[PDB]
């Protein structure tokens, strides 16, 4: 069994910051499951629009506001706590975090920590 | 992409009960991602040993206390939000919500929701 703690990871070289983002890496390719498993703080006033490419990902709002775009459709979603998307490499998509929003995120296949 | 909120799901047959827990599905195998993602509430009190065999689990404490217990160790770890902990068919387990607790489950591969 794996055991961890969110507060030890965010003190790692497991805890990445970007622009706009920061992300506690819990679980990444080395760690075997087969995806890759994340807590991801999306800053607010960002607009971002990063995907891994050649990967899937599902992300989970557990705190906070924003929206995601979808621009092959023009929809505009309300992200906020239970609040869950699914991306893929065709999906073409803005989240602009409102206030910071928190996220638990799944990559398949995982995320490496190496880029 | 897909984006679905958990008030929704949890008033569907997406939403299943057992002895000690509920769970909200988010995904599962026929949405397409490899792995399903689901809410699921522990409750106060029970004792949980369930494996899905054949799987791998990963699960982070959102809400709520209690314990995991690694029967293979004698470690018992403390539930906390920001805890997670990952399971395979090997461990021998035992999870123990001292309030209710609120966790993000993810399974590979993903549950099919027939069981």
Same mark, same amino acid.
């Given at each position: 069994? $794996?055991?961890?703690?969110? &507060?030890?990871?965010?003190?790692?070289?497991?805890?990445?910051?970007?622009?706009?983002? !920061?992300?506690?890496?819990?679980?990444?390719? +080395?760690? &075997?499951? &087969?995806?890759?498993? *994340?807590?991801?703080?999306?800053?607010?006033?960002?607009?971002?629009?990063?995907?891994?490419?050649? *990967?899937?990902? !599902?992300?989970?709002?557990?705190?906070?506001?924003?929206?995601? /775009? +979808?621009?092959?459709?023009?929809?505009?979603? !309300?992200?906020?706590?239970?609040?869950?998307?699914?991306?893929?490499?065709? +999906?073409? *998509?803005?989240?602009? #975090? /409102?206030?910071? $929003?928190?996220? !638990?995120?799944?990559?398949? #296949?995982?995320?490496?920590?190496? /880029?």
């Amino acid at each position: 069994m $794996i055991v961890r703690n969110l &507060g030890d990871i965010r003190k790692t070289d497991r805890n990445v910051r970007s622009d706009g983002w !920061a992300s506690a890496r819990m679980l990444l390719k +080395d760690d &075997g499951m &087969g995806f890759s498993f *994340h807590v991801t703080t999306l800053f607010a006033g960002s607009e971002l629009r990063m995907h891994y490419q050649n *990967h899937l990902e !599902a992300v989970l709002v557990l705190k906070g506001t924003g929206t995601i /775009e +979808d621009l092959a459709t023009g929809e505009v979603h !309300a992200l906020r706590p239970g609040v869950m998307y699914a991306l893929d490499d065709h +999906d073409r *998509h803005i989240v602009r #975090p /409102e206030t910071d $929003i928190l996220t !638990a995120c799944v990559f398949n #296949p995982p995320v490496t920590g190496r /880029e």
